[PDB]
Amino acid sequence: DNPNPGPDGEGEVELEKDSNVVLTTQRDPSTSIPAPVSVKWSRWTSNDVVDDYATITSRWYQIAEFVWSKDDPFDKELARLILPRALLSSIEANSDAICDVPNTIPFKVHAYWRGDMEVRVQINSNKFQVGQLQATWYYSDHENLNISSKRSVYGFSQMDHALISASASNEAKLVIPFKHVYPFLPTRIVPDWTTGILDMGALNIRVIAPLRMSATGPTTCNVVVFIKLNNSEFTGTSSGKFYASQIRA
Amino acid sequence: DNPNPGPDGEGEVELEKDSNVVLTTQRDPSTSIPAPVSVKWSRWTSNDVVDDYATITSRWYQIAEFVWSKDDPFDKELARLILPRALLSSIEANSDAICDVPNTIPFKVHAYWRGDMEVRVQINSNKFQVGQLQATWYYSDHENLNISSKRSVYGFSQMDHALISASASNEAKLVIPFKHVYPFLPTRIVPDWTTGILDMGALNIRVIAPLRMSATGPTTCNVVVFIKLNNSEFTGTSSGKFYASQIRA
């Protein structure tokens, strides 16, 4: 209630320090948790050496950056990421192999995976900009054919979601646990599973309030998405030459 | 003292079960330990996330197989492997990348390494064959220019070594701890270290007793070498695109 800015700026930085990667937020995160915390399931269907690599897999790594402008209508999708595929496809979109990033080197060598997720969607918007976005997670997007009529902010507001206001420039934390029909997702081509490899559903960022401003205001803003794999477990140690690149999309 | 063979053969299998890889020996291993067990040294020169991957790095993997025949003289080298280079060069000699084997995927992504070694040199020789080999480990072979006069079984018998008799078809276990001038070996091109990357010395298998037999005996025999990295520690998490292939030799 009594402001006194100095050379530092009178703020309070919140830190997310996860395995030598530190994320900083000026604002408070707007969290939303779709499902409760999952259990480890190496008991029921694995006899191979099952081990996470928490020093290299529970790190933060950007998977998407995009430009939200004022030339977007009311109900318009900005991002639609199939996150376990989107990590590998964001690496392959930077034109290299998957063995050059320490986050994804167990995906090259193992066969199956189960772990929870942490998604940070950070906007960099001016204080005078006005707008609002959704951060809605949907489990198993491709297994529903009527999802093309579902992708709208009217339907995504009904399930739980994270709101991002362009004025406050706040942040969206997304605790995504593993919830799938099968208790493991294969990383490569595996028997009677040829398509939809390592797909758990779509994080899709759409617009509620389009970006509004004055006549000479800053036209665009930037949105960056980071991901974390914290409660992982990798089973089925295999050859890396069996692995193939992801579908481009 | 009272033999009674059955359908099994009246034996006693010794097992080395190390992270879902099992090695079997009929005979007793002839061990030789050059130096006592080393200490971990992440305290003194690292602040990065330091972690081994004991589920995938403390496994067994073949690095050399060769054919010891009766057409070899007295003092003749059969194998000369610079073991930390020889693991990567044995993978690259099979014409693929290093990210296709789970043993060496932290070498793709990290910068430095320190860990002990376990070497199994297994011969498959007939009981009627007569001969004997050395398994001599030498620390930092390339840093001595008069080693070309040193490589002989007369000199290698003076330091400790492991003897392999072709009659008993025994086995040579080699507990090799980390003993180097610097406490870490870089995995790639690092500052003021351009050549001799990840070289700790030569395991060189030479002949003492050449393979002797009758006129119609089995002419050759086979020798396979396996390696294990048990007390590892990986530091300096880096990009995999900075890594380059090893020198062919």
Add this chain to the structure above:
Amino acid sequence: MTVSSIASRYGLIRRVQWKKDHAKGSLLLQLDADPFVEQRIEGTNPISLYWFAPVGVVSSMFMQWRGSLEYRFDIIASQFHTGRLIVGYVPGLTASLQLQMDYMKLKSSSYVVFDLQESNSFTFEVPYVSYRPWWVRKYGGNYLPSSTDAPSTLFMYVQVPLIPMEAVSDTIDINVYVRGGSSFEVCVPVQPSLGLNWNTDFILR
């Protein structure tokens, strides 16, 4: 009458000739990590009969199976034969990955190297690695859109070739026995995918 007492009995499914001239890394057998392992009889009937392990016969009646399998390898050799072979195990492979296989890609996955000096028999217990707690059986009740391959694939290469003495033979028989291990179990009863050979007569419509 107990399924864990039937599946705990070894049945001979394979014989493999391992010779002296087999090079370093030659394939002896590749097969499927399932109870449905076949041995075809070379008969003249228009429909062919097959030998199965008892675990495969008792698993044909049930839809879903899970657990470890135990492959007993009995290598008929003297105490003067010397050899060394890998019994490896690769987690899930498709049909296009059944090829492009050697002894070197095998050592990336789980594998066991066996030496043959004086003990001429061993038992490899097979891991159960899948995305699914159970596993739907290999054949259907003559419903061809219900076919499903193995969860994973077993291999047996030659790590060190055979060195026999000049007084013994140059060829060695290897028997492969199958029984469902201590963790093997089956659940849902369906129409069994196997039939008896008592009336081996089929009528085309």
Add this chain to the structure above:
Amino acid sequence: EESRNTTVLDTTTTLQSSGFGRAFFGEAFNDLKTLMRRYQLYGQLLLSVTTDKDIDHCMFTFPCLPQGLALDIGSAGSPHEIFNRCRDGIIPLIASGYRFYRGDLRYKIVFPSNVNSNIWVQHRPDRRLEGWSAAKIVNCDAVSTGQGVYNHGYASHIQITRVNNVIELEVPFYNATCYNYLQAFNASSAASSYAVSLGEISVGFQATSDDIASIVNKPVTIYYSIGDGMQFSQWVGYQPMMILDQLPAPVV
């Protein structure tokens, strides 16, 4: 950030809670599982016999899934007036607002009256469901594979039409999964097809060629409840609905 409340501007007072009608009607309508255990029409069909059938041939087949079949409006000439007029029931309307399920189902099949023949019903949990197309009641017209034939090892039951022409059965959960999908299924892989329906129910008559002539164009209706131990485990919002009294009237 969905059910949050920044500032609740209550201008009201305390309203007397009836306990979801338990005060007025002696029953609380809060547990939605109590609503879903009321039976609702899974489907209806007219029996049609094209080729000569044996005793082993199944008369019709249908996958057993809780979110309701592909909505059979019928032919343009003769539409099924229940699914055309009042489009869909309560149970799939609830199941549209979820993603995953696990549990059993309850099927009550009502057969025609003047038929007398003994009826067999098998449940085959082997048939994977290939796409939302052909997720419907299928008249078995020919027998090529082992689909048309009464098989041995499945869970079967025979209803005596002379005693009673209705069968009441419970389909158990037999998939090897954590859940199954609870939407209009889109087939991506082969393993995902195993995890849509519980199984596949085939109903067949033991009639011969002479007694099957009295069975043609007779209606068979199938009803289903939700069973118990039946859990929906992921909240998904509802799709675009359609208002029923906004549908056009058959003007003359």
